[PDB]
């Protein structure tokens, strides 16, 4: 899955 | 107890003319889904704002690629038509829960199912007003040097710091957050 | 079916020794975890296709919902310790995400009480060494596979399931393909 935290 | 660095941080480079309360999000971000669908942060912030203070919410496209771009444009449409409250839930659920939203066409379906006319959406989609609104969202993110979501800014001067709030109880968290925004706004 | 590395699964560059045969990670906060469990029944469908000698393990993650996420990981440890996962999974998902009646650890406790686990029995378990060990076990397992999100499933500490590489147009087909992939990786 996609990581939980949304950076960059 | 309200300390710079704790419940909030101050911007080194304040933004002139920024919206009073500015929230950034992405429909792709699981942390934004938490903020919107479980915690209802926006709603609770609104409830505690002084009567003469408006909330602004913008979509960001640094995640999700081309569909991320399409989602920013769809959010512009939502803002132009004033139907944010009709499409937020189905867009969040479609991207993250059911994973049924994979194209611009899927996004369009959500608006239709939400009671927004089909000719209305396509006129909005291709409009100069929406082109302007897309650029507006992109400018705002650049102006605050946005590196992550969810995020909230007050008066272009202060950034909310949820890391410094208590998370044992979700109601306590939500209200500490809402109270911080109100303190910074006032 | 044809099974390709990079398609239905990926191969860990850093395999883990001593990992559960089939290891699933979830969060009660995660909408796609909700979809996997309450809607698609991924775990149940995977179990059906495995020989019963192949055990399935499911761990909660704490990197979602702050301290409440940690409390849910501890509650999942209580569920595992007492063997009541099948009683509490549905009301916990519903409580966190649907009815939004689970806002703190005391609300989690009430769900166990309503599931048949007496208050004193829950509290005993909550404060037990066995449950403290299970919390640390769940944390360690996540760290050993460098876990960044959920839902996720690992087989034999060697492979990770890749739902993105599967047919997601038909949900009945997706579930069969997912479960068949776990079978193929396990029958090794």
UniProtKB/Swiss-Prot annotation, chain B:
**What InterPro entries does UniProt report for this protein, alphabetically?**
DSBA-like_thioredoxin_dom, DsbA/DsbL, Thiol_disulfide_DsbA, Thioredoxin-like_sf, Thioredoxin_CS, Thioredoxin_domain
Q: Where's it mainly located?
A: periplasm
Q: Tell me one Pfam family matched here.
A: DSBA
Keyword Disulfide bond carried by entry: yes
Q: What Gene Ontology terms describe what this protein does at the molecular function level? A: disulfide oxidoreductase activity
**Which keywords does this chain's UniProt record carry?**
Disulfide bond, Periplasm, Redox-active center, Signal
- Where does this one sit in the cell? Periplasm
Does the keyword Disulfide bond feature in the UniProt annotation? yes
Q: Where is the Thioredoxin domain?
A: 1-130
Which cystines does this chain contain?
Answer: 29-32
Q: Give the top-rank taxon of the lineage listed in the UniProt record for this protein.
A: Bacteria
GO CC terms of this entry = periplasmic space
Please state which protein family the record places this protein in: Belongs to the thioredoxin family. DsbA subfamily.
Outline what the protein does. Answer: Required for disulfide bond formation in some periplasmic proteins such as PhoA or OmpA. Acts by transferring its disulfide bond to other proteins and is reduced in the process. DsbA is reoxidized by DsbB. It is required for pilus biogenesis.
List, alphabetically, the NCBIfam families matched: PRK10954.1 (NF008198)
What protein does this entry describe? Thiol:disulfide interchange protein DsbA
Which organism does this record belong to?
Shigella flexneri
